Design a protein around this ligand. Structure first.
Ligand SMILES: [Mg+2]
Ligand SMILES: [Mg+2]
Ligand SMILES: [Mg+2]
Ligand SMILES: [Mg+2]
Ligand SMILES: [Mg+2]
Ligand SMILES: [Mg+2]
Ligand SMILES: [Mg+2]
Ligand SMILES: [Mg+2]
Ligand SMILES: [Mg+2]
Ligand SMILES: [Mg+2]
Ligand SMILES: [Mg+2]
Ligand SMILES: [Mg+2]
Ligand SMILES: [Mg+2]
Ligand SMILES: [Mg+2]
Ligand SMILES: [Mg+2]
Ligand SMILES: [Mg+2]
Ligand SMILES: [Mg+2]
Ligand SMILES: [Mg+2]
Ligand SMILES: [Mg+2]
Ligand SMILES: [Mg+2]
Ligand SMILES: [Zn+2]
Lengths: 174, 146, 37, 60, 213
RNA sequence: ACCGCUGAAAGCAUCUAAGCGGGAAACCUUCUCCAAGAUCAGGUUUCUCACCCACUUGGUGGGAUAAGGCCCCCCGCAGA
RNA sequence: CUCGAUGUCGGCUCGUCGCAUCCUGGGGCUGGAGCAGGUCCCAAGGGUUGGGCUGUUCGCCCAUUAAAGCGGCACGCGAGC
């Protein structure tokens, strides 16, 4: 089902194809992506993105649904970016900024600092809540997963770092 | 009596083999046939006939991606537990002219005269070779149809 | 994980997948994790 | 085999075409024309190419 | 970024510091040096600096070695060694003809002193390698200091390479790491180096700056 | 080993099939030593940089030198 | 295979290798609160004590230790003792 479907363009001011290549620019910065060579890409009548394949192989059906939900993740984040909302639980655990960085107090004997890479923008909203923002979906979730593993999971007191809305497992202990 | 080549009759020439999209085992075979003079009708197995082979672009030879992870090169130093090992993937970063060379030398006969034949091989990593004083004619890999 | 040369799902929400050339059982319950070996 | 692959034929299809044309030269003298007279070796390869069948992989 | 000097071990004395502790030092005459050559990567493939040390009479130096000094404009010295730098920054602080005296090191700097160990001759295995030997009684017949076994049995039918046996001991390049400079003395050209330094009293010594600290 | 991110075949889900991460006293570099007999016998330099005879005139035999070294001599904390 | 000879247990000296890991290093699950543990997976770089009794190997015991691993090599090693 995925891949037999057109992808809209709100602005997309540089939708270009130069030897199986693609780019996208708009309210945010630019991105780049290379599609595997049995899959082609072109423009529909509305400027929409439709990808095709030589039919009925195991290796072409997998890359066809793959290379649709990456192009649609380029034209999304350039127009409407990605934010991951994260919550700090546990008593005495909080979060601050120091410039562009983000320092944690996770019960350790030293503060824990997270250097934000070239494109990931931090912003707290509360002392125990913050959001990780950026334009590339794969690059945002990589940095959010580095913050999630900053404590070993504690299912007895629930202390640690979580995504918002997710429910970790809990045991009873003593 | 059948022909036996006198000394002073083996003419030689210079060939350059671009290695850009050629597998390691085709290019070793075609270089080792060319070093020994199998292609010349004056072949005699005790006489070093055959030509000079230059192999440029050794870092672009075609190796399957699952061999660079897994195919190993073993060496031993004579000392106990001196079996040192590398992979092809961590020789193509350092010495891409040794991978194309080692494939050729195992295809030459294991005798004294192949120690004289392997002196006629130059293998280079980049697209530029210093032997422009000679005139190496380029050599494409043929296959005679049948 | 439990590493045994016979793996099969235990409860009704274990899933039996194949990643990296080996058969393993992933689940929400952590003590149902298995792989062949 | 070396003198046949310069006239773009194999040793395989050279012995076949010489037998199909009725040329009974032994391999001693056929490997001495290959050195001492390379222009008459080609005139033999052109006879072993004409008497060879039209599709060599077709069943006979 | 790695200072060095050539010098001569002059022996060991003892001295005291401000906390009234005794410090066994090795007096090294880090004498005056001169450059004579600069190795560059565009010419030589690496980056180093030569150093000349020692007073020699100009008749004891032969004509090939003499003309190597005439190109540099330096009177001929006895010794001549190199200081290996990293891949850059040689000809920014060394020139041909410069005078490197002993005060390129500070006090409380850590140095690496390399040299040539004293000769011990043809030595046995209880001295060259620390073998225990056999007993001195209880029936032991003429094997008091001998090695004992040297291999297996009919598998393998050989002695493995690198088997520790008797031979000649010493006269090796030995680098001693992270020795403490106690007092630099620019009046006499003398470094007081805390501890032991490889060599006999009079031998050549390269004092480089440490990297492990 | 194991924990992941993005994501299809399989509208969901999955660490993987395309692609990218974190990750051990093991492996490779870094530090110490040997090492161009590495016969692919390496590099940067300076010095001498020159004569005579015989013969079947040959990348030919001898003789005498230069730079430089060895032997002898006085010895060594270098050493069978 | 060796009878016109292939010297046997233990100990001493000197070793090298495997991993089926005793310690140290990285982990999953736990009927893991914490501290200590159990179990399984990865890992062979180094380290792995000295005594009493016994010809002993093995084993019990004493005092420690981060721990006092298990095996191959003619049950390694007598032209070495
Ligand atoms: Mg054979
Ligand atoms: Mg993996
Ligand atoms: Mg002595
Ligand atoms: Mg000692
Ligand atoms: Mg003793
Ligand atoms: Mg006796
Ligand atoms: Mg005695
Ligand atoms: Mg024996
Ligand atoms: Mg590391
Ligand atoms: Mg050296
Ligand atoms: Mg040389
Ligand atoms: Mg006998
Ligand atoms: Mg555990
Ligand atoms: Mg294991
Ligand atoms: Mg061990
Ligand atoms: Mg290591
Ligand atoms: Mg053992
Ligand atoms: Mg034993
Ligand atoms: Mg035995
Ligand atoms: Mg015995
Ligand atoms: Zn389950």
């Amino acid at each position: 089902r995925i891949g037999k479907q057109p992808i809209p363009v709100p602005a997309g001011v540089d939708v270009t194809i130069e030897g199986q290549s693609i780019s996208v620019k708009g309210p945010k910065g630019t991105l780049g992506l290379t599609v595997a060579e049995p899959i082609k890409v072109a423009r529909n009548d509305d400027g929409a993105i439709v990808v095709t394949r030589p039919d009925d192989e195991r290796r072409n059906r997998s890359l066809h649904g793959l290379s649709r939900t990456l192009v649609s993740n380029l034209v999304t984040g350039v127009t409407q970016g990605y934010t991951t909302k994260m919550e700090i639980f546990g008593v005495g655990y909080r979060v601050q900024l120091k410039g562009s960085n983000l320092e944690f107090a996770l019960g350790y004997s030293h503060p824990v600092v997270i250097e934000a890479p070239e494109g990931i923008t931090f912003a707290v909203q509360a002392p125990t809540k913050f959001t990780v923002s950026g334009i590339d979906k794969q690059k945002v979730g990589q940095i959010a997963a580095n913050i999630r593993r900053l404590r070993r999971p504690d299912p007895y007191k629930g202390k640690g770092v979580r995504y918002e809305g997710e429910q970790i497992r809990r045991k009873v202990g003593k | 009596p059948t022909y036996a080549p006198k000394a002073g009759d083996t003419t030689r020439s210079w060939y350059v083999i671009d290695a850009t999209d050629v597998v390691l085992g085709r290019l070793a075979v075609a270089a080792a046939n060319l070093l020994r003079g199998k292609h010349k009708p004056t072949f005699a197995p005790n006489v070093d006939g055959g030509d000079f082979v230059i192999v440029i672009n050794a870092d672009k030879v075609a190796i399957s991606g699952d061999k660079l992870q897994h195919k190993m090169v073993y060496r031993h130093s004579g000392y106990p537990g001196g079996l040192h090992k590398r992979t092809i993937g961590e020789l193509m970063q350092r010495h891409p002219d040794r991978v194309v060379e080692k494939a050729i030398l195992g295809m030459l006969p294991k005798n004294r005269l192949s120690r004289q034949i392997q002196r006629k091989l130059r293998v280079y990593a980049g697209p530029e070779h210093p032997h422009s004083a000679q005139q190496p004619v380029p050599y494409e890999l043929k296959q005679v149809a049948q | 994980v439990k590493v045994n040369p016979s793996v099969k799902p235990i409860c009704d929400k274990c899933r039996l997948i194949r990643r990296h050339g080996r058969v393993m059982v992933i689940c929400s319950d952590p003590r149902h994790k298995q792989r062949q070996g | 085999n070396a003198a046949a692959r310069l006239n773009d034929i194999t040793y395989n299809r050279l012995i076949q075409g010489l037998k199909a044309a009725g040329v009974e030269v032994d391999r001693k003298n056929l490997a001495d024309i290959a050195i001492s007279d390379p222009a008459a070796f080609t005139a033999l390869v052109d006879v072993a190419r004409a008497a060879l069948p039209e599709d060599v992989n077709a069943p006979s | 970024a790695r200072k060095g000097i050539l010098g001569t071990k002059l022996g060991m004395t003892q001295v005291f510091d401000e906390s009234n502790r005794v410090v066994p030092v090795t007096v090294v005459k880090a004498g005056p040096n001169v450059v004579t050559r600069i190795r560059t990567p565009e010419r030589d493939g690496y980056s180093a600096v030569q150093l000349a040390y020692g007073e020699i009479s100009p008749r004891k130096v032969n004509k090939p070695l003499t003309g190597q000094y005439t190109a540099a404009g330096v009177n001929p010295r006895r010794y001549l060694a190199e200081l290996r730098l990293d891949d850059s920054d040689a000809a920014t602080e060394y020139q041909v003809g410069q005078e490197l005296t002993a005060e390129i090191f500070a006090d409380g700097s850590y140095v690496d002193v390399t040299g040539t160990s004293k000769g011990k001759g043809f030595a046995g295995t209880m001295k060259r390698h620390g073998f225990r030997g056999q007993g001195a009684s209880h029936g032991a017949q003429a094997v008091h200091r001998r090695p004992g076994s040297i291999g297996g049995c009919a598998t393998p039918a050989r002695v493995f390479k690198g088997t520790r046996m008797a031979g000649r001991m010493g006269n090796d390049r030995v680098t001693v790491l992270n020795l403490l400079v106690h007092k630099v003395d620019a009046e006499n050209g003398v470094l007081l180096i805390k501890g032991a330094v490889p060599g006999r009293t009079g031998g050549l010594v390269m004092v480089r700056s440490a990297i492990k600290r």
